[PDB]
């Protein structure tokens, strides 16, 4: 999977798309625009290097390379930005609908083959490499061409050609007064016709719920941190890849701008001597350290040489029982080690055998790890990791090795001596009841970083000029009211049984 995702938003501009079934409801055009804006925001937050486009079919005006009739390409394939969202915002309301009608027009005839041709031409215009090519059709007319059979055949042929070229097609049907049935025409155009997607739908498609669900977390494509050599001996060597399944998320680095005109400014740091005032090259400087009331001087090259112990890679040291590993010895986030056959052929078989036997014997491979050059070595343990899949066969635990760093003697600290007092069974039972009352199921993705979410919300509000930023609800805050309601009188009994009458914990 290499390249970029290109997406085209086809929006129908027929009369039926501007009628509301109920007074308190959103017209199809409004829902389509809202979905497009939500997708734009999600793409900006997650993947800003992707390509998106917005086109209209059924309008009176035309704007395209081929100069077809009644097709207006509002936005060509380009990276998303706040300007495009602001431009789309002028069609959100009813006033926006009137503005759209005045600017473009609506209620005119059209041919789907020409629309698909324009979409294909837009796809061809892109000069980058595209991993995916997708089109979504927002419409509420299940029979766009019922009077003319030739137009339907042309549309089917164009859809088949697009499928052959490798263009995916999706139909996001919108609510219709009489119901939208896909069986009339859209079976052939739609790339995949699901077994359940054959009945008549009296309501908008469920995919719009997914589209409107804003995603505010950066998504990073698979990448190998390093490609190292595992050396069972001076003659036996295999190639492995190291990945980081868990990585801390940081706010995007701030940029420095000029106040007057609002354009980037570039910085540069230069060292100079005080007396002469001229520039000082790195070769005319040294390093010093004061120990024992004396000055020790070393050159930069020697200073970097001080960290050279062994060449980068993993060096085998033996095998250790898994019981000797301690959970409370965590020092650094763990990594994932996987085979790589590109550099060495035959590594996969040896790695698989090692993993299988380590799982069978419940052992972990102790190793010396040196990620890069001029880096002091560390001690790591490779723990076997089996492949675990969920109910839907979607892999949740990949197979390989888990690299966990082990601490040195310096990394540990001494704790003050404290006397130990043991609680009687009654207090333990009361606290057991309290703990059981607040039982809940935990998972790795049940919490969100409030700081990052708030930063993204503020940035979006500033970019799009919203009246007030959206306030993110923090799931990390304890639900004091719920816990108090659930526990009931247990807390009072525990406090009576564990604390003296006059204790005053707060003070």
């Amino acid at each position: 999977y290499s390249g970029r995702d290109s997406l085209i938003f086809l929006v129908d501009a027929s009369k039926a798309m501007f009628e509301s079934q109920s007074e308190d409801e959103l017209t199809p055009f409004d829902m389509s625009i809202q979905c497009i804006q939500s997708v734009y925001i999600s793409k900006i937050i997650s993947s800003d290097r992707d390509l998106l486009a917005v086109v209209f079919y059924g309008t009176e005006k035309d704007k395209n390379s081929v100069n077809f009739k009644n097709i207006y390409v509002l936005q060509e394939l380009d990276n998303p930005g706040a300007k495009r969202i602001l431009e789309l915002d002028q069609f959100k309301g009813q006033q926006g609908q009137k503005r759209f009608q005045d600017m473009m027009g609506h209620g005119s005839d059209y041919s789907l083959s020409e629309v698909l041709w324009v979409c294909a031409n837009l796809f061809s215009d892109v000069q980058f490499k595209m991993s995916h090519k997708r089109i979504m059709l927002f419409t509420n007319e299940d029979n766009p061409h019922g009077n003319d059979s030739a137009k339907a055949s042309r549309a089917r042929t164009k859809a088949g050609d697009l499928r052959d070229t490798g263009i995916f097609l999706d139909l996001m049907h919108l609510k219709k007064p009489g119901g939208f049935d896909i069986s009339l025409f859209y079976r052939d155009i739609i790339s995949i016709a699901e077994d359940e997607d054959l009945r008549v739908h009296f309501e908008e498609s469920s995919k719009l719920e997914d589209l409107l669900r804003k995603v505010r977390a950066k998504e990073t494509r698979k990448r190998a941190l390093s490609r190292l050599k595992l050396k069972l001996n001076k003659d036996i060597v295999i190639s492995v890849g190291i990945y980081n399944l868990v990585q801390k998320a940081l706010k995007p680095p701030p940029i420095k701008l000029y106040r007057e005109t609002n354009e980037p400014v570039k910085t540069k740091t230069r060292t100079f001597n005080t007396s002469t005032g001229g520039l000082l090259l790195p070769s005319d400087t040294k390093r010093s350290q004061i120990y024992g009331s004396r000055q020790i001087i070393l050159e930069k090259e020697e200073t970097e040489e001080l960290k050279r112990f062994d060449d980068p890679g993993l060096m085998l040291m033996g095998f250790k029982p898994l019981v000797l590993l301690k959970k409370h010895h965590y020092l650094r986030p763990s990594l994932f080690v996987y085979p790589e056959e590109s550099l060495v052929i035959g590594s996969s078989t040896l790695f698989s055998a090692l993993l299988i036997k380590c799982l069978e014997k419940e052992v972990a491979a102790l190793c010396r790890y040196t990620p890069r050059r001029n880096i002091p070595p560390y001690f790591v343990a490779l723990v076997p990791q089996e492949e675990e899949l969920d109910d839907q066969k979607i892999q949740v635990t990949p197979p390989g090795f888990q690299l966990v760093f082990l601490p040195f003697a310096d990394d540990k600290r001494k704790m003050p001596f404290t006397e130990k007092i043991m609680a009687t069974p009654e207090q333990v039972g009361k606290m057991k009841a309290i703990v059981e009352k607040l039982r809940f199921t935990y998972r790795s993705d049940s919490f969100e970083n409030p700081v990052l979410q708030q930063h993204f919300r503020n940035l979006e509000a500033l970019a799009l000029d919203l009246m007030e930023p959206e306030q993110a609800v923090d799931l990390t805050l304890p639900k004091v009211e719920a816990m108090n309601k659930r526990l009931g009188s247990l807390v009072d009994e525990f406090k009576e049984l564990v604390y003296p009458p006059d204790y005053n914990p707060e003070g």
Partner: peptide
């Protein structure tokens, strides 16, 4: 393929965060 994100292909649709839900 099943349960795939409609915004970012190649990635599974991450479910919404639910925080703590007592039994």
């Amino acid at each position: 393929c099943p349960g795939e994100s409609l915004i970012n292909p190649g990635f599974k649709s991450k479910k919404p965060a639910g925080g703590v839900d007592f039994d």
